[PDB]
């Protein structure tokens, strides 16, 4: 039941560097590919099956493909504190940078590295015995994450096809932004992501900054702070396969009970409780208020008000010792709650997965050791507003043909520009027709 | 190789700018309150068959030519402007300039030849509703040259009476002939600056 | 080989199917009827050519 991971772009590889540390801490693996000699095991010899594999003598290696073109962060990992853990060959670093250019990421440089990463993917899959799905981690606002990521998505869909894909992708914020030419890359990668990735999970830099500002009490957060709770969210998502869950949901429950239409797969994410040490032991963490904070609009990784839309469906993964009576009462309270409104055609729309593993703590972190945690993945219809606002940004740039020559100097024409535009328009129409 | 060692430095970005021409039958092009145009594109502006929609909620499909000319055009505000077709016909020099059908809101339905407005051209213009039936308020055929039609024309009043002559919407002192066809009399003379100044009234 | 009775019976079946699909949703029936009429005119042209 192993799950493989692909990290594309500098953002993806940084998230992986900050997330595989969480995995190697959860499964008690020393940060050099081994277990401690003394019995310091939470329990089980296969809780780490989904991510690692023993080789002769306790030398586990992660099922990760860290693919990036420009080799400044790949070799940063290579010389970091994880050297005897990672596989020397999985860490694929190209020759030159993609430079915010979907063209250079997808046609010029991508074509000579996709077939090099694909063989390692094939070897990992053949080694795997019960492969479950793909988890992609990327940034649409850059070159390698958008271009190379979309190319790899297409060339894995053409080959494996049936297997599920979970794409954690970051988008630019409505106001806060770093790259100038990010709308072009965002729309171009969105067109590819629409019909290939099975389930798309969305992240936003400012939407994590403001949470780290209002909850974790940090007025100067950073990427090394966002990536930690991103790792927390993905761990909350994947804990069901790992640990013994009384009411647990494998990877296919997300697609089975949260994708009513194949076109509609775009999901808000939330995670409670985002608390630090100072207020942790002063507050009381209970399944009522943690869930309520999950469903409040101020604790979402996607900067978007769910008020403007209707929650189509939702999944709630619970960690720690939680008794199902309280979560059933909590979802009853949510159904009686007024502000959030559902489309009337879904009477039952709450999947409640539960596990028996409490959330982990990383030394030097911000979050503290807690009893229980909740991850809320909601297929709502407020994400059409996100796509429409990004499109309205794109229109002004495309009207004056700005930055277009950089793109078209490579194999990219204007036909795919227009087709990505109309694809986003069709997505807008679909979301609005879902409507009432 | 010889491919690299070629006069390509300046030429690379020159050909990139050329390839950024923004032409070809794009699937669509959008703005904010802009000219949503779908169709063939060349010469950096609308050129070729295609439909254009814009702020006036009027979705008209025609043959674009760089906006220095235009082919057959069908201009209409259907079920939103609430009118089936407002203009239908070929264009030349960004003007119909030929066979054209126009439909006012309720004023009239003009099907005829005309170049740069209705300043010249021979055709028909039923200035009344119910054009399928004789109940039409009137039917005029001849040379338009302004709102004052200013030419040799002829119109039927739908009561059977017909006018045949020179016309400046009236009152051009042009020798005309008018037929009381119902009665059986006819008046030939000069509509001098009015419905009547002189002439001869006779018995067909 | 072609037979007028075969054509008539198949046309009747198409009418019954389009009735069913219209009862489901009418727009599909509109499209099916338009497609029916279009290959009807095509076969009419072919018959004239023959």
């Amino acid at each position: 039941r192993e799950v493989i991971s692909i990290h594309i772009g500098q953002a993806g590889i940084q998230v992986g560097n900050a997330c595989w540390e969480l995995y190697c801490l959860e499964h008690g693996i020393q940060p050099d590919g081994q277990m401690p000699s003394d019995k310091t095991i939470g329990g089980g010899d296969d809780a780490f099956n989904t991510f690692f594999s023993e080789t002769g003598a306790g030398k586990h290696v992660p099922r990760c493909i860290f693919l990036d073109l420009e080799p400044t962060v790949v070799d940063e990992v290579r010389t970091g504190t994880y050297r005897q853990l990672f596989h020397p060959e999985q860490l694929i670093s190209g020759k030159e940078d993609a430079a915010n250019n979907f063209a250079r990421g997808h046609y010029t440089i991508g074509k000579e590295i996709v077939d090099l990463a694909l063989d390692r993917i094939r070897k990992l899959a053949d080694n795997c015995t019960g492969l479950q799905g793909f988890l992609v981690f990327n940034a649409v606002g850059g070159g390698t994450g958008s271009g190379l990521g979309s190319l790899l998505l297409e060339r894995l869909s053409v080959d494996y096809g049936k297997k599920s894909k979970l794409g954690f992708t970051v988008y630019p914020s409505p106001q806060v932004s770093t790259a100038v030419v990010e709308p072009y890359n965002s729309v171009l990668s969105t067109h590819s992501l629409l019909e290939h990735t099975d389930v798309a999970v969305m992240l936003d830099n400012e939407a994590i900054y403001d949470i780290c500002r209002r909850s974790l009490d940090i007025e100067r957060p950073t990427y090394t702070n966002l990536n930690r709770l991103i790792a927390q969210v993905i761990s909350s998502l994947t804990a069901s396969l790992r640990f013994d869950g009384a009411l647990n949901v494998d990877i296919t429950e997300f697609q089975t009970n949260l994708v009513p239409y194949p076109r509609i797969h775009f999901m808000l994410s939330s995670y409670a409780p985002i608390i630090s040490a100072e207020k942790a032991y002063h507050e009381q963490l209970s399944v009522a208020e943690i869930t309520n904070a999950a469903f409040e609009p101020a604790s979402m990784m996607v900067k978007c008000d769910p008020r403007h839309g209707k929650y189509m469906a939702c999944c709630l993964m619970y960690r720690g010792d939680v008794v199902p009576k309280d979560v059933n009462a909590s979802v009853a309270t949510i159904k009686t709650k007024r502000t959030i409104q559902f489309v009337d055609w879904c009477p039952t729309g709450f999947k409640c997965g539960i596990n028996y593993q409490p959330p982990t703590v990383v030394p030097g972190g911000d979050l503290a050791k807690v009893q229980r945690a909740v991850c809320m993945i909601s297929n709502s219809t407020a994400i059409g507003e996100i796509f429409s606002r990004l499109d309205h940004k794109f229109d002004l740039m495309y009207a004056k043909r700005a930055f277009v020559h950089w793109y078209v100097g490579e194999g990219m024409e204007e036909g795919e520009f227009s087709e990505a535009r109309e694809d986003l328009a069709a997505l807008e129409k679909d979301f609005e027709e879902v409507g009432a | 190789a010889e491919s690299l060692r070629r006069k390509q430095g300046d030429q690379l970005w020159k050909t990139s700018d050329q390839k950024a021409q923004k032409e070809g039958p794009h699937h669509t092009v959008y703005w904010t309150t802009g000219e949503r145009y779908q169709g063939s594109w060349k010469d950096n502006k609308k050129h070729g068959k295609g439909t254009v929609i814009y702020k006036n909620s009027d979705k008209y499909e025609g043959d674009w030519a760089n906006d220095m000319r235009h082919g057959l055009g069908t201009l209409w505000l259907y079920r939103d402007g609430k009118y089936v077709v407002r203009y239908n016909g070929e264009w030349r020099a960004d003007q119909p300039t030929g066979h054209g059908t126009f439909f006012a809101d309720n004023g009239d339905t003009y099907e005829g030849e005309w170049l740069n407005g209705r300043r010249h051209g021979k055709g028909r213009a039923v200035y009344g509703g119910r054009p399928v039936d004789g109940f039409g308020g009137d039917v005029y055929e001849g040379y338009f040259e302004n709102d004052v039609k200013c030419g040799p024309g002829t119109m039927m009043y739908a009561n059977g009476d017909v006018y045949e002559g020179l016309w400046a919407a009236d009152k051009k002192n042009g020798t005309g002939t008018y037929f009381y066809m119902s009665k059986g009399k006819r008046f030939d003379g000069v509509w001098a600056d009015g419905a009547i100044k002189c002439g001869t009234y006779s018995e067909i | 080989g072609i037979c007028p009775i075969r054509e008539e019976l198949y046309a009747q079946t198409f009418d019954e199917l389009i009735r069913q699909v219209t009862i489901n949703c009418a727009e599909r029936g509109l499209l099916l009827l338009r497609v029916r009429d279009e290959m009807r005119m095509t076969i009419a042209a072919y018959q004239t050519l023959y």
Partner: peptide, 19 residues
């Protein structure tokens, strides 16, 4: 199948035929 799907089929066929 959806009503949006069928109306978009109408639009697509008409656009492809307007050549």
């Amino acid at each position: 199948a959806t009503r949006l799907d069928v109306i978009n089929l109408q639009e697509k066929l008409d656009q492809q035929l307007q050549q």
